[PDB]
Amino acid sequence: TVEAKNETFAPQHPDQYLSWKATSEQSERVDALAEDPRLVILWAGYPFSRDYNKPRGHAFAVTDVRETLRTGAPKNAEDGPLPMACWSCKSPDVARLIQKDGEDGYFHGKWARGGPEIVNNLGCADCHNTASPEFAKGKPELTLSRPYAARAMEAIGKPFEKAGRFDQQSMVCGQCHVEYYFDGKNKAVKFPWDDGMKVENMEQYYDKIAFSDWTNSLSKTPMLKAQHPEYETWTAGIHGKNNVTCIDCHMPKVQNAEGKLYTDHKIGNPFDNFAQTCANCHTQDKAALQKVVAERKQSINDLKIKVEDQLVHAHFEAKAALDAGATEAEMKPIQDDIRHAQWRWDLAIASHGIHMHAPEEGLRMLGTAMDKAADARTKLARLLATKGITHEIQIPDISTKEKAQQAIGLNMEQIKAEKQDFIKTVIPQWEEQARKNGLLS
Amino acid sequence: TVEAKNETFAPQHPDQYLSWKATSEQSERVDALAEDPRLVILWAGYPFSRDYNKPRGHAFAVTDVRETLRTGAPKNAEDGPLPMACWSCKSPDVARLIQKDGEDGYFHGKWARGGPEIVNNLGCADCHNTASPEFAKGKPELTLSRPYAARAMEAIGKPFEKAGRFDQQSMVCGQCHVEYYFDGKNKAVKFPWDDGMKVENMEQYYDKIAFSDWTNSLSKTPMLKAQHPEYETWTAGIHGKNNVTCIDCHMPKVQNAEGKLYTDHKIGNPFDNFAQTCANCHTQDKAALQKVVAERKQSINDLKIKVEDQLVHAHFEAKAALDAGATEAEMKPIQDDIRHAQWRWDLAIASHGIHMHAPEEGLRMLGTAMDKAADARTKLARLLATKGITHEIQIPDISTKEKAQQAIGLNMEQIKAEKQDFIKTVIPQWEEQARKNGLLS
Ligand code: HEC
Ligand code: HEC
Ligand code: HEC
Ligand code: HEC
Ligand code: HEC
Ligand code: HEC
Ligand code: HEC
Ligand code: HEC
Ligand code: HEC
Ligand code: HEC
Ligand SMILES: O=S([O-])[O-]
Ligand SMILES: O=S([O-])[O-]
Ligand SMILES: O=S([O-])[O-]
Ligand SMILES: [Ca+2]
Ligand SMILES: [Ca+2]
Ligand SMILES: [Ca+2]
Ligand SMILES: [Ca+2]
Where does the UniProt annotation locate this protein (chains A, B)? Predict the structure, then answer.
């Protein structure tokens, strides 16, 4: 069965083990709502409007899902707003339970449930078939420990077991680094890849099944949320197209002291080891590549803010149209535009690596998002007119996260206090039960 | 001393002379307004709404400016819609005239004035200091024969005379393959590069001097026209950033029958000699690089059309607001938006090579265009409402060039009749006068 206790592997594999543990150095947790308060409006009614940080080291996955406001402060195993599926991409204990109880049995019930079962840091069994006798010998034996990922990979015509070593490499990361949704009453993780991985494929896919992630509480639009589409966007970009794998840049072959070759498990910023990553294929100075990348980053940033500003006006303008007496049939075509505009925006920048992995596709999707936002705001102006409104809709102060959160009716003081008490008192009980059950060293 | 009679150099320089002359093989003249009737509406009130074709071989430069509807049917040297400056990038006689009469004397007057003076095909003295003794020996002796280009290069901190061989290679192309405007009552060519070559730099530059190319007959917006900014956009793109020169792809070094190395002067599509072009730096095969380029071309085209459709609507809605009583002060803010939107769009796709030279910059520009086009149509929906118009403005059928042109008031048959007559009777008289005067063998 799966060995979720990572430290079990330290003596046999010092080089991988030590460099894997070192992601605990990537510890800064940057508040992205604070940096961009518009996110709060666009995600109004959804948990991302309460708390959304930039990623950090794999070592912090378990603690971050515990600590994010998104998972709240459940007082028992059937409480809290979120289901078991929130653990899915955070811990090899997921592979353990999936193997122990079956996939269906793993996904059943609330996040709170897994509290005392999912306790080991994202680790060896997530990516490796550790039970294989070859793993002991120092062979990677890569595997997809997540059945939902195995299925998604077949669905794009790339079954894992039939793929070469190098395709498999990126697929391992594509177990988590993807856009997904919770399918069914049991909220199983599903990748919406049935029709392809492009924004248009997914848009039409989500529309066919009339899926919606939540209802924007300002405009009452049935929204889609995107998440960190690295696999999909990497596939579209020029590096992907040339089979430069996630590993080529994020997990370089390096030497130990006795000169032995090993894969660097300290997954982080490839530029921190330029000599072993880009320099491997590129003759350019580090500073020159960093500057090209910084420039795409700013290009996308500037454009992304313009689309967001439009979407902010659209949400508040739809709120106005609702208050002035707009009926459901009158809102519908506006709401379709907003749903679409925002999906395209969200998928365009939900991956923080887009300006590197596929800057041109990032840019393209934003442009198509603007086209729909224009359609939404044009329709809205005409709808407001029919209700006797011909002036610009005024927008409350959203210059800080705090003001944006207050403006959509969040009681943060209370939301935060309830989470702090959950963190202090519940987490140690969970860890104490896990140790008792032999789950946690 | 400037020799505009190109055949003089044939004996001494058979390899360059023969391939140069060969651009005459690239003879298809594809009508771009026919491919895309939307352009007719965007350019309403401007010669481009009459006639605009995709580029062909250098060999046809003199014929094309003569034959385009944009230059009209002048019956004498003072007549015609357009000025001397239209010759500036079509013939080495321009260098002859500028050296002989000076830059101001070259620019003074009407395009008609030049008919019997500007008669040799784009050629040697455009790019080469042919007077140099080192030139007879087979050394390129590249030069900027166009002084307004020399000033423009100096303006962006790349003075021709201080530049290496490879900077200079693209600079000779940057004498013509640039965005430009006509400066002063005499209409001298100027590259709007003073504040930089980014779309934002030129928009600010143009707004700073309140410049307008023309007024859109539909919306009465003061408009900017973009023209083929290959130098600016090649600069912004990844190749340009690595000093891959226009020459590396469009003018490869080849070998003559006797194994002698020379520059291929047949300037055309680099894919036609992949082995000598791209294969020099890339290991990917021809079909694979072609399909990447074809993808980017499709991406941009899709976004392009979305932006153009918004702009078309913007112009007809502005027309309707005008027909419905809107004042100048009411229109001003709307016209600013349209002005900026279409400038950003026009500079993004005025280069037919943008999908290859700098896909990501093309796409980034179309996104920013979409942003102002959205503000414009939102402003217009409100203004229209204040005149009691709350329905969508209907657009005439513009599915073909012929119907678009008809819709903006053009009398295409008359325009064509006048142009045909002018080509049949006037051109020959020009050529005869130039022979008479030894300017044309
Ligand atoms: C199928 C993969 C997957 C699932 C399911 C998933 N995550 Fe994530 N999560 C990721 C990846 C990949 C990152 C880091 C990349 C990023 O944030 O862009 C991440 C980052 C995070 C972070 C740290 C950054 C932040 O947003 O503050 C938190 C907290 C988090 N997830 C909570 C959750 C919650 C709550 C759920 C249940 C709704 C969930 N995750 C479900 C893959 C997943
Ligand atoms: C998040 C993904 C991921 C996790 C977590 C992970 N591995 Fe790896 N591992 C990889 C990939 C990818 C390779 C490279 C396989 C190849 O070269 O084809 C690799 C390589 C290896 C190898 C083969 C030798 C080498 O260095 O190339 C060993 C042994 C190994 N890892 C051990 C571990 C141990 C022990 C852990 C837990 C401490 C761990 N791995 C966690 C993805 C992961
Ligand atoms: C089992 C789920 C899982 C898998 C497998 C996985 N990731 Fe992650 N990854 C995450 C989560 C969750 C985060 C965010 C951690 C946090 O913020 O606490 C993350 C973060 C990251 C980061 C941010 C590091 C930092 O310090 O900012 C990078 C880079 C990254 N992953 C790359 C990869 C690569 C490359 C692979 C493939 C070898 C991979 N990941 C495989 C879940 C996963
Ligand atoms: C060819 C190089 C390259 C490849 C291929 C690549 N990465 Fe990246 N990635 C980078 C670089 C460099 C950055 C940081 C960009 C920057 O510093 O602005 C990054 C950023 C990221 C981030 C966000 C990091 C953060 O801390 O915000 C994640 C997550 C990520 N990559 C995951 C992946 C995954 C998953 C794959 C495979 C599907 C992949 N990368 C393939 C080079 C690469
Ligand atoms: C294992 C090979 C490999 C690695 C590693 C690699 N590159 Fe690339 N890079 C390529 C290939 C292949 C291309 C496609 C063009 C070509 O054929 O050279 C490319 C293209 C690029 C481009 C031009 C595409 C664009 O974005 O406009 C940039 C920039 C770039 N790489 C930067 C980086 C950076 C930064 C890193 C490290 C973070 C990196 N590369 C690592 C092989 C690699
Ligand atoms: C002095 C003016 C001038 C300069 C110098 C010049 N161009 Fe041209 N170029 C033109 C004009 C005008 C056309 C369109 C000709 C026509 O349609 O008759 C053109 C057309 C082209 C085309 C389209 C050819 C086809 O068959 O479709 C290419 C490619 C091109 N130029 C590249 C270059 C390159 C590379 C350089 C630098 C070596 C260069 N040009 C220098 C003015 C110039
Ligand atoms: C500063 C350089 C420059 C000047 C000034 C210039 N052109 Fe051009 N012209 C070019 C280049 C470069 C091309 C080919 C690139 C393209 O068409 O996209 C071209 C193409 C053309 C063509 C063939 C393609 C078409 O559009 O039908 C015509 C005709 C033409 N120009 C007419 C004119 C007229 C009329 C003027 C004066 C209003 C003018 N040119 C001024 C550089 C110039
Ligand atoms: C790295 C390769 C590369 C370099 C560098 C390059 N070109 Fe291009 N260019 C191309 C290719 C390939 C095409 C045609 C794209 C296609 O086939 O769809 C093209 C298209 C063009 C076109 C439009 C041709 C047409 O018929 O529509 C012009 C004009 C042009 N290039 C001129 C230039 C100029 C001027 C420079 C220097 C400023 C330059 N090129 C540098 C590869 C290059
Ligand atoms: C529109 C630009 C342009 C035109 C027109 C042009 N040349 Fe060139 N020529 C170049 C460039 C660029 C080179 C390459 C210089 C280098 O390799 O640095 C070159 C190279 C040459 C060389 C040097 C040897 C070689 O082949 O590399 C000679 C001689 C030459 N051309 C002759 C001519 C002749 C004769 C004509 C008229 C028949 C002509 N050129 C027209 C731009 C031009
Ligand atoms: C004189 C050298 C040179 C030649 C010739 C050349 N390239 Fe490149 N190309 C580069 C360099 C350098 C990069 C940047 C990435 C890297 O460092 O390899 C690049 C990057 C690229 C990229 C990745 C950027 C992107 O758009 O995503 C593509 C695609 C590409 N080249 C296509 C072509 C094509 C097509 C041709 C000929 C039609 C060509 N190249 C000719 C040197 C060259
Ligand atoms: O919420 S998870 O997808 O980062
Ligand atoms: O980042 S290091 O390779 O210079
Ligand atoms: O009209 S000319 O600039 O292509
Ligand atoms: Ca980070
Ligand atoms: Ca989703
Ligand atoms: Ca052509
Ligand atoms: Ca212009």
Answer: Periplasm
Task: Tell me how far apart the alpha carbons of residues B64 and B55 are, in angstroms, rounded to a whole number.
Answer: 9
Contact of A56 with A25, CB cutoff 8 Å: no
A381 touches chain B (CB under 8 A): yes
B368 at A interface, C-beta within 8 A = yes
Question: Mutate which of B371, B375, B386 to test chain A, going by most A C-beta atoms within 10 A?
Answer: B371
Which candidate from B299, B370, B386 shows the least CB-CB separation from A370?
Answer: B370
Element spanning A223, H or E: strand A222-223
Q: Is A150 exposed, middle or buried (0-12, 13-18, 19+ CB in 10 A)?
A: middle
Q: Taking the mean position of all CA atoms in its chain, how far away is CA A116?
A: 23
Q: Residue B274 — φ and ψ, nearest 5°?
A: -40, -50
Burial of A299: CB neighbours in 10 Å, binned 0-12, 13-18, 19+: buried
Residues spanned by CATH 1.10.1130.10 within chain B? 1-267+411-441
Paired sense of beta strands B181-183 and B188-190, if any: antiparallel
Tell me the C-alpha distance between A365 and B366, whole Å: 11
To 5 degrees, how large is the angle CA A344–CA B226–CA B331?
A: 75
| Residues of each domain in chain A carrying CATH 1.20.140.10 | 268-410
Q: Is the CB of A68 inside a 6 Å radius of any atom of ligand 1?
A: yes
Give the largest CA-CA distance in chain B. Answer: 79
Rounded CA-CA distance B30/B18 in Å is: 25
| Helical ranges in A174-285 per DSSP H | 199-208, 230-236, 238-241, 246-250
CATH topology of domain B268-410: Butyryl-CoA Dehydrogenase, subunit A; domain 3 (1.20.140)
For residues B265 and B257, what is the distance between their CA atoms, to the nearest angstrom? 16
Bridging pattern class, strands B214-215 and B222-223: antiparallel
The Cα A16–Cα A13 span in angstroms is 6
3-state secondary structure of A77: coil
CA dist A104 → A83, A147, B4, B170 (Å): 13, 11, 82, 63
DSSP letter for A45, please: T
Give the angle B288-A244-A356 at the CA atoms, nearest 5°: 100
Are A292 and A275 contacting, i.e. CB atoms less than 8 angstroms apart?
no
What is the resolution of the experimental data for this entry, in Å?
2.3
Nearest CA in chain B to A237: B292
Angle at A98 between CA A95 and CA A101, to 5 degrees: 145
How far is A49 from A30, CA to CA, in rounded Å?
A: 15
Q: What's B160's DSSP letter? A: G
A363 to B368: CB separation less than 8 angstroms, yes or no: no
Determined by which method? X-ray
- Rounded distance, CA A53 to CA A70, Å? 11
* C-alpha A10: how far from chain center: 29
CA distance B281 to A129: 40
- Among 1.10.1740.10, 3.40.430.10, 1.10.1130.10, 3.40.190.10, what is the CATH number of A1-267+411-441? 1.10.1130.10
HEC string of B22-72 equals HHHHCCCCCEHHHHCCHHHHHCCCCHHHCCCECCCCHHHHHHHHHHCHHHC
Longest dimension (CA), chain A: 79
Residue A203 annotated as lining a ligand binding site: no
Map tokens 């032999």 to a residue. Answer: A438
